[PDB]
Amino acid sequence: KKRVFKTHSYRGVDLEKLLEMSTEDFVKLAPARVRRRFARGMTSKPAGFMKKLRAAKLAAPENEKPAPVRTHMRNMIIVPEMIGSVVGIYNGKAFNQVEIRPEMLGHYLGEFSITYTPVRHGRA
Amino acid sequence: VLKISTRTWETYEMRIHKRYIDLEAPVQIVKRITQITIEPGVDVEVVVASN
Amino acid sequence: ENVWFSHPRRYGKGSRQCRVCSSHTGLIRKYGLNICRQCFREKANDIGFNKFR
Amino acid sequence: SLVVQEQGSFQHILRLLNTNVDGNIKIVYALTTIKGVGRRYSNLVCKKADVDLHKRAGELTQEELERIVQIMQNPTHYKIPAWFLNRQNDITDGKDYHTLANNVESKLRDDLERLKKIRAHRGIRHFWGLRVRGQHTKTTGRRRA
Amino acid sequence: ALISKKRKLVADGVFYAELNEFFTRELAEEGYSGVEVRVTPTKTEVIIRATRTQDVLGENGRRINELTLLVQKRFKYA
Amino acid sequence: AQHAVILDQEKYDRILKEVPTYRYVSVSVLVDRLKIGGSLARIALRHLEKEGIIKPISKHSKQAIYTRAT
Amino acid sequence: PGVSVRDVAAQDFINAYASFLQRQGKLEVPGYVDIVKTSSGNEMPPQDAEGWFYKRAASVARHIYMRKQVGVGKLNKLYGGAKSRGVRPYKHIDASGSINRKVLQALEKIGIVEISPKGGRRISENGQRDLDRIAAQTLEEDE
RNA sequence: GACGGAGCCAGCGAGUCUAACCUUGGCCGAGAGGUCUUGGUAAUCUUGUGAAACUCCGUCGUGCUGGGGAUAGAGCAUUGUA
């Protein structure tokens, strides 16, 4: 065998040129919601998060899962800069330790932390 | 005519009475007619040649 | 000397007050008199929003 | 229009785009029996294929129907301007497909399916038998399931 | 100015409301009976029709000074 | 579409042999003789008013009255 | 006796003037004809598919003879309609601004309309000319 | 009665100063929207709010149907720190 299988594509752009491209070219090919999100708010939104994020991605224990990087920015779009890192996402409590996946691109961090224990009609 | 809905509901209204009198006039008796006959409640606006 | 004391209070229901009594609720905003509706009902002669008909 | 005198050229139910289509009614809404080609889309296919709109499905000798077939899985190839489509900037190849009868639901499937690859709250709201468009489940929609 | 006449009259009513409630709270022990607001050239007269206005006039220039000053410094009046 | 949104040759000839004595023909008449639907009922009204047989004395679609040429 | 297009009923004039500008061939039917909605307050594309633009050109031309001026947005406010909000009742929306604006540019190119001062579009002297002329034609075909 | 042209009609109204309201017009875009000015602190301009229900001319023909617009998807954009 010779074929190292393939990478997934975001919208016609594979992962190998996703991670090492930019934030802003990603939000170019990201849809109108993410493009409108990063069109405004140019005042360094993942500020402490990126520094601690890369600090635990570099403090990762030798190709294991990195240390949790905890934030309240539920509204943060997963960008290919943070692929392979570990994010702690709030919901009222409960810092959810989440692996960032290659395929997880384009959507909000608050989509990855459920904010309620669901319904339980009855269920004693 | 202005109307005011207010809360078992409630309604008020209103009365802006606005007119214009044009006195193509010397400035002497304009100054006199604007200093004299002061009165509570009435707004006088003294503007100049129609432009 | 304090850096963490304020949410954006420029819009929302908390963005103003009743000038009599601080109210966000019941606040009349037509013609900007900024009175809550119950104090509007009370001070409507002091401001002059009279019951005419 | 006019009385014409047509013959066994008038043929009833035929299969185009993998499903069966009723004859003797207007081609525009004959094609809306087919999945993925809506009323606007089928209307514009019957316009852009140089087809008389007023005919039935009982008419339409095979060239115009074959060109309609050719249009429906090749939208921007024959100038359908990609605002008139359903799956813009696709999700993997990033192109603009107008997916069809056995494709569109499948590609619809693929959208929902890739949510289970991501773990977003969209799929989480999908799985429990609920509405993902955020409206209340408290009072409305009671014939549900 | 640059005030719409609708908003102008509503704001004048708000001003007379603050006059009435404030001078109600203020000069109640002078037997405050009412204000009236009369703007003339060079003046804007708030008349305190009341029972005991010698306690309003003040010692050879007092509290009517201080009351005009309170109204002055709140309402940004010259 | 119960039947006859196409013309099926013998139908128009049976119309020409069955519009004598029709005091009342219209869209709904050419439907309700167990016959041609309102798409090409208008076509056969236009094509009998094309020559002779039916004469119009009202105006528009949803409401017509056409007669025998007497 | 003398004619005006106010002196003629509107609908038969607009049919005759649609057929007249069909005869003319001075069109500007930009290229997105019948792939377009022609009014945002509607769903389906127009039914004739060769034209609807001469109909709308006739309507805009006679409506500009009868008025001082109308704008792009005024024609959007005119040819807009009540589109169904489905589970909710109806509401009026401005039409597609492109289509009406291209009708204005088309009638400007022929000299049937002219960009008005104060904003809007006045009927041109050739516009008044051609409208009253084939309005006289539309009466004398019904004489 | 749907659908599109085509005629195109009100009254009660609200509208921006020590700011960002009504928006005309003109373009660009199917659109959404955007652009640029323009007027109106309002019998002045938005606005004559050219509203729909309505009127004509047909596409439909009695068919969960072209009635009905539930679901749902993806894209485009606007509101807003989100």
UniProtKB/Swiss-Prot annotation, chain A:
Pfam families reported for this sequence: Ribosomal_S19
UniProt keyword annotation of Ribosomal protein present: yes
GO terms, biological process: cytoplasmic translation; ribosomal small subunit assembly; ribosomal subunit export from nucleus
A single cellular component GO annotation: cytosolic small ribosomal subunit
MF GO annotations: RNA binding; structural constituent of ribosome
Signal peptide: none
InterPro entries the record matches: Ribosomal_uS19, Ribosomal_uS19_CS, Ribosomal_uS19_euk/arc, Ribosomal_uS19_SF
Cross-link (Glycyl lysine isopeptide (Lys-Gly) (interchain with G-Cter in ubiquitin)): K17, K28, K57
Keywords: Acetylation, Cytoplasm, Isopeptide bond, Ribonucleoprotein, Ribosomal protein, Ribosome biogenesis, Ubl conjugation
Xref: NCBIfam families: PRK04038.1 (NF003121), uS19_arch (TIGR01025)
Function: Component of the ribosome, a large ribonucleoprotein complex responsible for the synthesis of proteins in the cell. The small ribosomal subunit (SSU) binds messenger RNAs (mRNAs) and translates the encoded message by selecting cognate aminoacyl-transfer RNA (tRNA) molecules. The large subunit (LSU) contains the ribosomal catalytic site termed the peptidyl transferase center (PTC), which catalyzes the formation of peptide bonds, thereby polymerizing the amino acids delivered by tRNAs into a polypeptide chain.
Stated family: Belongs to the universal ribosomal protein uS19 family.
Protein's name in the database: Small ribosomal subunit protein uS19
Protein's organism: Saccharomyces cerevisiae (strain ATCC 204508 / S288c) (Baker's yeast)
From Swiss-Prot, chain C:
Record keywords: Cytoplasm, Metal-binding, Phosphoprotein, Ribonucleoprotein, Ribosomal protein, Zinc
Phosphoserine found at: S22
GO biological process terms on file: cytoplasmic translation
Main subcellular location: cytoplasm
Similarity comment: Belongs to the universal ribosomal protein uS14 family.
Miscellaneous comment text of the record: Present with 6490 molecules/cell in log phase SD medium.
Known partners and oligomeric status: Component of the small ribosomal subunit (SSU). Mature yeast ribosomes consist of a small (40S) and a large (60S) subunit. The 40S small subunit contains 1 molecule of ribosomal RNA (18S rRNA) and 33 different proteins (encoded by 57 genes). The large 60S subunit contains 3 rRNA molecules (25S, 5.8S and 5S rRNA) and 46 different proteins (encoded by 81 genes).
Transmembrane feature ranges: none
Residues noted as binding Zn(2+) in the record, renumbered to the chain: C18, C21, C36, C39
Function recorded in the entry: Component of the ribosome, a large ribonucleoprotein complex responsible for the synthesis of proteins in the cell. The small ribosomal subunit (SSU) binds messenger RNAs (mRNAs) and translates the encoded message by selecting cognate aminoacyl-transfer RNA (tRNA) molecules. The large subunit (LSU) contains the ribosomal catalytic site termed the peptidyl transferase center (PTC), which catalyzes the formation of peptide bonds, thereby polymerizing the amino acids delivered by tRNAs into a polypeptide chain.
Source species, domain of life: Eukaryota
Protein name: Small ribosomal subunit protein uS14A
Record's keyword annotation contains Iron: no
From Swiss-Prot, chain E:
Keywords of this entry: Cytoplasm, Isopeptide bond, Methylation, Phosphoprotein, Ribonucleoprotein, Ribosomal protein, RNA-binding, Ubl conjugation
Cellular compartments annotated: Cytoplasm
Top-rank lineage group of the source organism: Eukaryota
Residue numbers of Phosphothreonine PTMs: T42, T68
A GO CC term attached to the entry: cytosol
Keyword Methyltransferase included in the entry's annotation: no
BP GO annotations: cytoplasmic translation; maintenance of translational fidelity; nonfunctional rRNA decay; ribosomal small subunit export from nucleus; ribosomal subunit export from nucleus
Keyword DNA-binding: no
Major subcellular site: cytoplasm
One GO MF term: structural constituent of ribosome
Domain KH type-2: 19-78
Family from the record: Belongs to the universal ribosomal protein uS3 family.
Miscellaneous comment text of the record: Present with 146000 molecules/cell in log phase SD medium.
Known role: Component of the ribosome, a large ribonucleoprotein complex responsible for the synthesis of proteins in the cell. The small ribosomal subunit (SSU) binds messenger RNAs (mRNAs) and translates the encoded message by selecting cognate aminoacyl-transfer RNA (tRNA) molecules. The large subunit (LSU) contains the ribosomal catalytic site termed the peptidyl transferase center (PTC), which catalyzes the formation of peptide bonds, thereby polymerizing the amino acids delivered by tRNAs into a polypeptide chain.
Descriptive protein name: Small ribosomal subunit protein uS3
Organism encoding this protein: Saccharomyces cerevisiae (strain ATCC 204508 / S288c)
Lineage, top ranks: Eukaryota, Fungi, Dikarya, Ascomycota, Saccharomycotina
Residues of the full protein shown: 3 to 80 of 240
UniProtKB/Swiss-Prot annotation, chain F:
Subcellular location: Cytoplasm
A biological-process GO annotation: cytoplasmic translation
Keyword Disulfide bond among record annotations: no
GO cellular component, one term: cytosolic small ribosomal subunit
Main localization (coarse): cytoplasm
MF-aspect GO terms: structural constituent of ribosome
Keywords attached to this entry: Cytoplasm, Methylation, Ribonucleoprotein, Ribosomal protein
Keyword Ribosomal protein: yes
Family affiliation: Belongs to the eukaryotic ribosomal protein eS25 family.
Primary role: Component of the ribosome, a large ribonucleoprotein complex responsible for the synthesis of proteins in the cell. The small ribosomal subunit (SSU) binds messenger RNAs (mRNAs) and translates the encoded message by selecting cognate aminoacyl-transfer RNA (tRNA) molecules. The large subunit (LSU) contains the ribosomal catalytic site termed the peptidyl transferase center (PTC), which catalyzes the formation of peptide bonds, thereby polymerizing the amino acids delivered by tRNAs into a polypeptide chain.
Note: It is presumed that the precursor part of S25 is engaged in assembling of the small subunit, thus being essential in ribosome maturation.
Record note on quaternary structure: Component of the small ribosomal subunit (SSU). Mature yeast ribosomes consist of a small (40S) and a large (60S) subunit. The 40S small subunit contains 1 molecule of ribosomal RNA (18S rRNA) and 33 different proteins (encoded by 57 genes). The large 60S subunit contains 3 rRNA molecules (25S, 5.8S and 5S rRNA) and 46 different proteins (encoded by 81 genes).
Gene for this chain: RPS25A
